[PDB]
């Protein structure tokens, strides 16, 4: 399998992305991702959330009181995906305009 | 709306990357990426390269001959994109261990 579509299968798709910038500062709760993405349901931001997981990339932290805690953090093999997912954040803050006139025709 | 989901729009799905990859190194014709990739098809080939096209990614140049010849290759546009598809070629050629390891 092609390794440029091996990576794309882990940061891929509408919302690991997002889901993967907002950990780059730091651990976040459920809650607080819900808010940084008011569209995702919450059954899908859950499975995103367990994919990321199954892939090593994120970490889920369970704090055993009642009602638990629940953390999601970038994982040290998570982070090695951040020179990525950082230059996709400029390109794509640079080249919005452009691409919009592109598709303006 | 998220710069990364944005890049990701553009880049992004299941063989964008690939054709990209291999219009790095020159134009190609229609039969090359077929080559180079067996499991697409010729249907699904066709709209991803006309999608990178609508979003000034890739050129087509059309040669008006009998039969036509049709070239592929990457805009200066298109370009700018080579760092971020390179180092997620690289990730992915050095990562493919670990990830399938936590996989299974």
Same mark, same amino acid.
């Given at each position: 399998? *092609?390794?440029?579509?091996?990576?794309? &299968?882990? !940061?891929?798709? =509408?919302?690991?992305?997002?889901?993967?910038?907002? @950990? !780059?500062?730091?651990? =976040? %709760?459920?809650? #607080?991702?819900?808010?940084?993405?008011? /569209?995702?349901?919450?059954? @899908? $931001?859950?499975?995103?959330?367990? +994919?990321? #997981?199954?892939?090593?990339?994120?970490? %889920?932290?369970?704090?055993?009181?009642?009602?638990?805690?629940?953390?999601?953090?970038?994982? +040290?093999?998570?982070?090695?995906?951040?020179? !990525?997912?950082?230059? @996709? =954040?400029?390109?794509?803050?640079?080249?919005? &305009?452009? $691409?919009? /006139?592109? %598709? *303006?025709?």
């Amino acid at each position: 399998g *092609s390794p440029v579509e091996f990576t794309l &299968d882990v !940061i891929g798709g =509408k919302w690991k992305g997002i889901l993967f910038y907002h @950990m !780059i500062d730091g651990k =976040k %709760r459920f809650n #607080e991702f819900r808010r940084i993405c008011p /569209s995702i349901t919450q059954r @899908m $931001l859950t499975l995103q959330l367990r +994919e990321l #997981e199954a892939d090593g990339i994120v970490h %889920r932290e369970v704090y055993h009181q009642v009602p638990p805690k629940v953390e999601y953090s970038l994982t +040290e093999f998570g982070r090695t995906l951040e020179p !990525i997912v950082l230059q @996709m =954040k400029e390109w794509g803050e640079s080249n919005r &305009d452009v $691409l919009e /006139s592109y %598709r *303006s025709n």
